[PDB]
RNA sequence: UCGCCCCUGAA
RNA sequence: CUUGAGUCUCGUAGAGGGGGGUAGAAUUCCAGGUGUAGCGGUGAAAUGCGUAGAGAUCUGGAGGAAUACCGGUGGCGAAGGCGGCCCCCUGGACGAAGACUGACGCUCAGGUGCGAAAGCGUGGGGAGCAAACAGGAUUAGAUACCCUGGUAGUCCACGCCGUAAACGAUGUCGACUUGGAGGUUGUGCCCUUGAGGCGUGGCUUCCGGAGCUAACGCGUUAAGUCGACCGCCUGGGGAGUACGGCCGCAAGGUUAAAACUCAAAUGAAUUGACGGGGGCCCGCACAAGCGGUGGAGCAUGUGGUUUAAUUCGAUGCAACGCGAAGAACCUUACCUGGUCUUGACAUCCACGGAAGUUUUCAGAGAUGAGAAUGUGCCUUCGGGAACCGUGAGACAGGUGCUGCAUGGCUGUCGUCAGCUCGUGUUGUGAAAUGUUGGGUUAAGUCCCGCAACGAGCGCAACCCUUAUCCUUUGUUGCCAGCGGUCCGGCCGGGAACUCAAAGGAGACUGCCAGUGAUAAACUGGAGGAAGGUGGGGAUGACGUCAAGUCAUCAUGGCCCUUACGACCAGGGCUACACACGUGCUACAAUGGCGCAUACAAAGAGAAGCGACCUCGCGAGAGCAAGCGGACCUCAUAAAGUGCGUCGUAGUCCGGAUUGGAGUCUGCAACUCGACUCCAUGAAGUCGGAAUCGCUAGUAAUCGUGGAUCAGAAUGCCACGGUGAAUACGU
């Protein structure tokens, strides 16, 4: 994709970080692996996965990614124009616009991302197994899918001409 | 050429000979490139559906022409010629080497033209 | 798992009878690594044979063993589709080894002085087959002509035979024998 | 045992040696003392200049104070007061006179000990482990070098597992007969243990030190070989 | 084809 | 009203269902014939069966059960399920024109019917197989798998029970949504001029798109996208059990809990690991060979045991001739006793004395107390500096304890061809790709291909050394051409030659042919001293084993403080009734002993080796030259060889044990040194079960030297001599 970090305006922020493991012949490495999102408040959000022999590195690299896997959003207010609560993976994802004079409600990783994301009135929910790492699919559910009122209203002007040409 | 002048006994110089003649062979094809490309005509897609994923994943256009198990992907203009070159390369003698060979032919006089308004 | 071929041994001349074959046997007779020693039994020996029988000198030794040489040794190996071991028809070379190897054998269950006249003795009966070292020759010829299930090994092998043309008697193996 | 340190002949005839002296039948002994127990204390003394490595010349009749260092500056001080004072601690151990020699002038991302030392003076400041080497090593490949590879035992944050922490950047090979392989130790003496450090840097690729420059001697073509002559 | 079991724990 | 549904008509195909007939093959029984000593079974066996005539083989007769092939993701049924052939009765499906009915439909708790196999009741039938059962076998045991028999049962009729991983682990019905290929069955069309060419329906596999899924995958016959109705689930174990009800003749089936107890249980997938899973490839891994060990004695270590101590650590291989490269005292940590306490060893502070030198006594010395003597370096002449003793503390010392606090070092798989990483792509992710595949090599080696492109470590690489030939330098080394001769490289001469050892020449699949994708490579060939990682070293990765080592050394914590520290004399380490590991020496004539005789290499050396000459049986001692050296000495190489003998004996083999007499090295050799001399003369006549090494200058065997060392090699380490067998083949 393209980049997500920009000066006078980056918005570094990190989601998950953790080890993981791979059973070498030998003995046992571990993989230096986690997830980020560089925002700008105004979208343009992503995400990677790093992997190092150093919790350092596995940022940096992450980040690198997050600018490879950019989505854009675009949008009105300080909250969400459209509702999304399809699902991605098995952890389960809703996502509701919401009046500003409320919070993020949301401990997860969807306080974080969506905060990143020019959004910080919206209330957010989901259900299923508690995994932070698939709550960052909140990403295709949410930011990736949207409705705008200049979308749906191009509905309402194709059709008229149709009419017009037959 | 310079590879019989420091290396210089046979147990060195035939031994770089070797090794290096054949990288060349088809590495060959790939060092007369310049840039980045910002265009990029494929004539298959069983080897070259590659470029419909990854250069739009970037977004540089690839420009496909009409498949028999796919549908073309990025900014196309299709084209009369079909996916596998095992079967259509004669084909593309007066298809796709008259329209995109002499896609450039016709490029290079309006480049000029554009060049010409921008001087003035 | 062996890799190319095996070595070759270039070895002299002898003095008294020129021969590479006959040098082989003062190498069997050869014990601590000394050739020297070795050379004395020979001639001591081949001198006994031509008095106590008639023969040539390339006849005291060659058509006596030419008489304890089986042409088939019967080797090892558990796997035969029977828990069998198998017959093998040795090569002329090891035809040759076998005999020498014999002779030297039955003059360590000897203990009739020196070592010249056990072995010469013994050669001189070895070629009326009336020896003792002939009647090592009577166990293992005996055994692999009188019992075969030759080189197959049988379950492994009948599958093989089955696949080629529709066999369950003996032919070559075209699929696995592992 | 899991590295056996193969710098036995990389030290040979592949980059010179670091002690060059000669000894004869009853000299070899004391020789072989005297030179090492000035070193202990030498080293010691010194420590306001970072010590590429100390090395002795011995034409057994002379010692030759022969320190190197990558700033010269500090240890010259004003006049010779300085260096005179670390000059009579050699004279006084090994049985000749004694004098000053040259130290080095070069940058110092150069020589193992140079870089050695300084992270492990750091550890005993109980700042920077993991990241110690990191810093130590941007600096080294951004100059000098042609691949380093650092060995540090872990011990950090009071936690009692032995570990190890290891990192290389660029090519260390460790078997190569015509480069000049860097090698030297340094350990520090911290409350969260000892924590041994090893420096190789792989300073040559295809050049050696004593693999090039130097002079054999014979054929020297002539076709006579002289002869004493008269007849009697 | 030649049966054939049994094995306290955190690096 | 007709699009849903249903009927009518005409055909179509099929192991649909039920019933009754019928054929042959095979096994078995019975009968007869032929023929004789085995049969049968198994990995081997045994039980069983045979001269009273089996097995096999042939002929006749009889019976029971099942229908080889056919035969296929082929077909049919609602499902369960259904196979030789024929008849009868009978059901379902589908297609084709039309024709008709006119939502009559869909689903369904209850209810009702159908139910593989086993089972149960009742009556028939009984060949084979087979629970049970009985021998045999395998196994430590084997109430089993395995073998030989064999009963209920399986089979038929009728009734009953109603379960099954009753499966597509997928409720049924209706509706939709890319396609491709095959299979099967109707029917329309096309010079049907092609068994078929083009359609269009029904059913059935495989592939796969979108989509869905956590993934595997499903994928128009859905797990896709919708609706309708019903059934079920709501953590696992407890438990499909208990309790009650229901059903059954019963066996049991059916409905169906709770107490209690746990923080998981579980599904899919990832990488490695393992498999008596498979495929592939190597190594003395095996086969084929050669030589040992375990037997015996001695040497050496260890365990056990004992002792005041038998100092400590190591624990298959990778501990156990290891750390320890020689343990008389010391060493030495251990014991017993003597002895000291800021100290034996350090710095600093204070005092005196410079340290010392030669001697005395007591004592086992450690020491303790003296007797004389010394006044260097600077000085202000006191004092200090080195240094010594004593005092005092802060301290010092500790091979004291933790290798589960650690460094450093090392072993290990393994000289293994592997091991990773950056970047991109693929996957939600773990990760994957690369690194896999097709060839090939010793090689992640090289080539080609393939979402991989590059790169690092390891292999290889470059380094040494050796196989040749050349170049220098020729003394202490060489001696041809040249002379002496003393005939000896001993002297001159000659540097040619060998030799030394520095530097080069050389080998690279380089070249020739074939083979191999024309690629790498492989097989022969040539030239050469040598061909195909030439041979041998160095080279031993990143790592794993919390592997070892606080006792080489370093060090976090801990502990000892007129001591656990320190020093000394004696003792213990070499006990000992034994066991184990690693070696060495024999058991002999290819040898022993006696005579004479052949040639070595590489190291070592003024606490040293020591020619010569003298003496000693000897070990060795005296006398003494030479040598820090291609000088001289250790050094006489030994097996070997030509002769003398002995004759297969426990001996002329073998050499243990002990005594006496001597030697040497040391202050001194008593436990606890080695060598020699003479005597005594051992066990053993060549070693089970078992187990190990080795593919060539190796094995084998024979000596020699070196380090450690005042003085101790059957050990380790290194050097040469002579010098194989065997390898089809994995």
């Known amino acids: 994709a393209h980049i997500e970090k920009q000066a006078g305006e980056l918005q570094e922020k990190l989601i998950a970080v953790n080890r993981v493991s791979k059973t070498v012949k030998g003995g046992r490495i571990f993989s230096f692996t986690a997830l980020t999102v560089v925002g700008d408040g105004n979208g343009r959000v992503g995400f990677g996965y790093g992997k190092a022999r150093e919790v350092p590195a596995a940022i940096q690299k992450a980040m690198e990614k997050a600018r490879r896997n950019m989505i854009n959003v675009a949008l009105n207010n300080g909250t969400l124009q459209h509702p999304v609560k399809g699902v991605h993976t098995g952890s389960r994802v809703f996502m509701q616009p919401a009046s500003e004079g409320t919070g993020i409600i949301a401990g997860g990783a969807m306080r974080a991302v969506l905060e990143v994301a020019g959004v910080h009135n919206v209330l957010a929910k989901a259900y299923g197994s508690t995994n932070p790492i698939n709550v960052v699919r909140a990403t295709i559910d949410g930011l990736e899918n949207m409705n705008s009122p200049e979308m749906v209203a191009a509905k309402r002007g194709k059709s008229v001409e149709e009419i017009l040409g037959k | ?120 | 798992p062996r890799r190319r071929v095996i070595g070759q041994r270039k070895i002299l001349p002898d003095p008294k009878f020129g021969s590479e074959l006959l040098a082989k046997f003062v190498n069997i007779l050869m014990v601590d690594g000394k050739k020297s020693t070795a050379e004395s039994i020979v001639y001591s020996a081949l001198e006994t044979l031509a008095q106590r029988s008639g023969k040539s000198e390339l006849e005291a030794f060659e058509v006596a063993l030419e008489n304890v040489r089986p042409t088939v040794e019967v080797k090892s190996r558990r796997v035969g589709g029977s828990t069998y071991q198998v017959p093998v028809e040795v090569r002329p070379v090891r035809r040759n080894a076998l005999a020498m190897r014999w002779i030297v054998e039955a003059a360590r269950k000897r203990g009739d002085k020196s070592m010249a006249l056990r072995l010469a003795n013994e050669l001189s009966d070895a070629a009326e087959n009336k020896g003792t070292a002939v009647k090592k020759r009577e166990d293992v010829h005996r055994m692999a002509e009188a019992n075969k299930a030759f080189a197959h090994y049988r379950w492994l092998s009948l599958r093989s035979f089955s696949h080629q043309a529709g066999a369950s008697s003996k032919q070559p193996a075209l699929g696995y024998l592992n | 045992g899991q590295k056996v340190h193969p710098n036995g002949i990389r030290l040979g005839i592949v980059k010179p040696w670091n002690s060059t002296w000669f000894a004869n039948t009853k000299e070899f002994a004391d020789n072989l003392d005297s030179d090492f127990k000035v070193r202990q204390y030498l080293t010691k003394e010194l420590a306001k200049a970072s010590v590429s490595r100390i090395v002795i010349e011995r034409p057994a009749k002379s010692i030759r104070v022969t320190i190197h260092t990558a700033r010269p500056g500090i240890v010259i001080g004003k006049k010779g007061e300085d260096v005179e004072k670390l000059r009579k601690v050699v004279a006084d151990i090994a049985g000749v006179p004694a004098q000053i020699n040259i130290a080095e002038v070069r940058k110092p991302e150069l020589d193992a000990k140079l870089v050695a030392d300084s992270i492990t003076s750091q550890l005993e400041r109980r700042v920077m482990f993991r990241r110690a080497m990191k810093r130590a090593v941007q600096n080294a490949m951004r100059l000098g070098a042609k691949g380093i590879k650092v060995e540090v035992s872990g011990r950090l944050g009071g936690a009692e597992i032995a570990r190890t922490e290891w990192y290389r950047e660029g090519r260390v090979p460790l078997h190569t007969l015509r480069a000049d392989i860097d090698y030297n130790t340094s350990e520090a003496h911290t409350t969260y243990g000892v924590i041994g450090v090893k420096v190789w840097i792989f300073k040559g690729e295809i050049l050696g030190g004593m693999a090039a420059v130097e002079q054999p001697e014979k054929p020297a073509a002539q076709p006579k070989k002289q002869q004493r002559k008269g007849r009697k």
């Open chain 2, 1 to 120: 050429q310079d590879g019989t002048f420091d290396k210089l006994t046979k147990k060195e110089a035939l031994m770089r000979t070797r090794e290096l003649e054949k990288l060349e062979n088809s590495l060959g094809g790939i060092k007369d490139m310049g840039g980045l490309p910002d265009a990029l005509f494929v004539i298959d897609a069983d080897h070259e559906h590659i470029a419909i994923k990854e250069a739009n994943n970037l977004g540089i256009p690839v420009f496909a022409i009409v498949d028999t198990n796919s549908d073309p992907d990025g900014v196309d203009f299709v084209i009369p010629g079909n996916d596998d070159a095992i079967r259509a390369v004669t084909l593309y003698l007066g298809a796709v080497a008259a329209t995109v060979r002499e896609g450039r032919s016709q490029d290079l006089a309006s480049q000029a033209e554009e060049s010409f308004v921008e001087a003035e």
